[model samples]
Target chain A: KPQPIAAANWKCNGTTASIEKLVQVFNEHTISHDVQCVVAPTFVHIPLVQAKLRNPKYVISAQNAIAKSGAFTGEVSMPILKDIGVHWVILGHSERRTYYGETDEIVAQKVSEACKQGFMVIACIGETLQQREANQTAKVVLSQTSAIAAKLTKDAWNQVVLAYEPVWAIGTGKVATPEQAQEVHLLLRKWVSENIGTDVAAKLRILYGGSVNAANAATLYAKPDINGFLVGGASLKPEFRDIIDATR
Target chain B: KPQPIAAANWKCNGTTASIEKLVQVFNEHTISHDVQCVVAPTFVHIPLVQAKLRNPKYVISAQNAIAKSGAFTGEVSMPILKDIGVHWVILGHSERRTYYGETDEIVAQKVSEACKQGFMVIACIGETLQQREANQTAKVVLSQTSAIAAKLTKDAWNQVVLAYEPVWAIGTGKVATPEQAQEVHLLLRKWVSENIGTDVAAKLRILYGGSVNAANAATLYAKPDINGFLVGGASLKPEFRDIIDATR
Candidate 1:
């Protein structure tokens, strides 16, 4: 069975001092042995975050990485992160796809590249406001997942954790109802079982990433297929502890 | 007078140990009072690079920054860099405009925003191989500079260091003869003088960034308007010492 995880997508926020403060608060508790926690800071703060974090309870993560290393000015790469001891990367977040030029191809390439370098990829997939309003949520997620699926071998599924981050819910403080996310996660698993393999689907972990906070995390985590969360805005506050507690 | 400066664009390279080795070598030599130095590491390496570096010689710089600071995952921003003790940002590098979707307008916004918050910006402009081959180098640089020109205030030029990285020459090991660069640097000054102001043009520290290594740095630095080099490949080598010596 997959471990329940609370991955904080700190996004483009926090300085060394501010992040340390958050980590200090988090260190007061032990992460449940069966659960996992990750804090993905902006690249500039990764080293600081890595050093300040105490207890193996919280793993340091990178918000993103380039598919390859070399001459890509202003880009971070998997090798660089791996060497820096960042073993996890949050790929294809809604913000990356929407603001940056990350197409389905680019996301797939990034996930494939990360797994190639032996890093765990929290691969994200979801629909926009317009797509959902048009009832294209399943199609959007399937299309996004298929692109990544095409790039991976069945063996790489062990290092892959899919995150469903509906664009409409991210940072808007508008979260999908627990049922809404479960509906998507269930269909996603079915898609994987049919296309990849039933064994891979059974072991896969699909996380809900949007406006997840302590307020409703337990119920969201209660969903059988909603294994964990790729949390955003709420991750900065004290309640990040609360969100992680839900994992237990 | 514009102080001669050597800015190392490490791009997507370096591990902590490697960067520390470079800085340890650099810190051994005093930065000439008349010259300036900067090392722009990829975002993830900044903090580690910052802590390891010594002597007031090497100013820390970020390879890029977003104009504003909220919710853009994987993006760096001026305020974050500023608080991190990084006072310089390399904006609009050719690699960004070519590979990523950084357009002229996006470049201008970033340069303007960085200057707005009081960070020095190494605003870059260049001609691609096709554009230069078509005898459009002058037009291309003028067009690129004009967009950034539109967003900056007359006072902001003090916080600006214009970098002209000829696309064909960067990382290709093809050197832009000193005269070829002087010609572009000369015309770039004329463009700034006519479009912006004579005072701003004269004080602008125009840098040539393309295949600069110890082999030919002195002659390149001797070009009348070529105040310094935004060194790429050579920065990782021991010859980085010689390049800094050229600034003296």
Candidate 2:
């Protein structure tokens, strides 16, 4: 089985001073061997965190990356991330898709490009509140997965971690119920099995994001298909250590 | 008179090692006091360059910045830039407008926000080959400028440096003839005078960017309306110093 992951998506918060404090607190914690820890800070702070990080277990990730390598101003590409010692990139986050007009095709292109550059990708896929309310969650999730599925070779699945973050849950304090999250994870795994085969699906790690807090983490982690979490707000607090501990 | 400026837009290029080399080379040159120098590096490398920058004459700039300060994942906002000691931000680059869907309104919002935060802005505007061929250069320039003009206070004009880069000449090695660049630049200044008053227009420094190299820097800088340059490729090379010296 793949190791569980407790990844922090700091979103747009943090200054150098605060981040230094977070890194100090994070380094003081004893991360379990069962969980793979990652922190995605704002782009400007990645190097600062990378330089200050003392734990070998903690990996640095970029919140997003551009598809191409050059002249895309205000965008960081995978090569630039790799050169900066970034090991993972979070793509297609709900915020990007909702605010920045990143389409499924653009997400797929970024995934393909990141994979080719040898960066692990935490590719996010989920439905909006309307889609969920209308019972079109599976359709929306599968459509998103299919775009990435078409781009990935069977072997490339090893480098991809799928994150399911319902749009309504993000920053709204409305987390998907454990069962609600499990159903989506199971459906996604089943799709992966049917599309890419059981061997890859079994090895793949699916994470649950959106409103993941210390109080709710244990129940979500207990779901058989949910390997870990892509935490948001709570991740900034010391409670993140508890979420990481829950994986054990 | 406005201080002559030579700004380098290192769009999505440079690593820690290469940036160190450039910084060393940059520091060795005796920059003339007549012209202000600014270098915009990839966001990841900004701090690295900031810490190493020895010359007070050379200001640090971010290639782009987000309009707002929170929850904008993968983006650096004006406050974040200010916190990190970045004094200037380059907005509305052709690459961003073309690839990232930065419409006129979006650029205007960024300019307004950056100005409110008290960071100097290198606001870029230009016409495409098609727009230029159709004899709509002034129409396009004014339209692009109008969005920003609406957002600026009379006092804010002092903080904005308008850059006119003909899209057809950017990265194509087709340097705009001195007369051609002057024509568009002259028209933009006239528009600024007609709309914003002659006092503000006379003080507003309009730069010409688009394959601006050391070889042509002197001739281009000599144009009355072309105060300086927002250099692209040549900015990365050692010859950038010569471009700076041309202003003297």
Candidate 3:
């Protein structure tokens, strides 16, 4: 099966009018493919985006969700996200971990909660520039994975799509060369094989997400280990279609 | 003078659809007589709330703003809130200070940022049940307020609405009765008179906020020094109209 490819991490951009235009562009440009596609808009544009979605092949996701129900004050809850027809939730992005105070443990909790509440997860993991500089990339990735691995069952693991985004390459306009990305993807597959099972590792789709745009996507996807992408920045525009086409 | 009343602290509630409905209700109800209302919606919902507002008589507010901008991931910023039409903000609510690790100093910095952005503020101060049992209510309130007060000029001080909400009374059904609320309001007024200036104190609106619902709102609003309310859980519901009416 062709692995699924998705785009659109609105990431705190665009107003209602602008989102409507983006959705219209998605409707016009898309030619149905075997791969599943998705758009993750900010909580503000969920209603507007959901209303404009034309097909089941492509769906909506939320950037994040809170754990609880009654009074988290300013959080978007998983239940609410689900209520609005969001089928996927993104967790443990470097932005959430390094910028926000989201530790690996908290991201793990969020993933576990999201799984229990019937949401598929695009779980992101990466080594910081500092960690890569120190030659501790694998060690850091293993530690971050272990936090979530401890909370999940082998069967529960199937609901997740892992995205290996190198923090150094994200939004710095420096795409990780295909070889650099495949190295981490192969390592992750090895880790999953050992931790869960060889069968599960073979079936799980691991994606690359770090400054992914149309210009460089095909080369990245040609790598055997690079199944798909969890794009940022460029995802908000019509050029995302060009990246999606790379999956073919 | 009616005193510049600010209430409707919409704590941890409302989706985009619900927020739109509430704004319409507020505009149609036309309760602009006795108070200057500001609805604090979740960060995700604030921009939507701002767009529906047809009149400037009632403005938008944020429940909280994150300490920094850029990579803080899911945080709202004072500047962002300002750009989106939230003219007022509440900092250091009892729940924020106690449950969320918001220290007096962080709350002070928030007030400083809000002032710098020219946003109005409703700064909350309170004593915990334990602190009250030890008769340390005044001391706690003064400490919290003094930290924020240190950052304000007389002009900025006039733009703030001081809220004296006893921590013990929040969310618990045990509201500080009118007399108890009055005593704290009196202390806040006296503190403002001494610290900022008597002229500013006379014009400032000091609100009581803790478990305040429609039933007790009249008695609470009847207190001589208690100028208005900074309602909590009840503020999200339609019952907020009663609290507004009580001020009339």
Supply DockQ values for each candidate. Answer: 0.86, 0.78, 0.35
lDDT of prediction 2: 0.90
Best by lDDT: 2
Q: On DockQ, who's better, 1 or 3?
A: 1
**Pairs in steric clash, model 3:** none
Off by over 4 Å in 1: B31-33
Q: Which predicted model would earn the best DockQ? A: 1
Per-residue CA lDDT of model 3 for A79-169, tens digit only, reads: 6676556769888888878655688889999999988888889888999889999999899888888899999988888788888889998
- In the range A1-248, model 1's lDDT, one tens digit per residue, is 57877899888888778888888988887766677788988888887887778867778888889977799999999889898898899889888888888999999999999999999889999999999999999999999999999999999999999999899898999999999999999999999999999999999999998989998999999889988999988998989988988977
Which tens-of-lDDT digit does each residue in B1-248 have in candidate 3?
44646477776666667767777877677665757777877655655676787755577777777644334435556655554556788888876776566789988988887887887888888898889999999998998889998887778886788888887787888999999998888888898889889998888888888889988998988888888888778877777777787887
**True-structure Cα RMSD, model 3:** 3.6
> Count of backbone clashes for each model?
0, 0, 0
The lDDT of each candidate is 0.89, 0.90, 0.78
Over the stretch B82-180, how does candidate 1's per-residue lDDT look in tens digits?
Answer: 888988999998889989989999999989999999998899998989998899999999999999989988999999999998999999999899999
Quote the positional error of residue A69 for candidate 2 in Å. 2.1
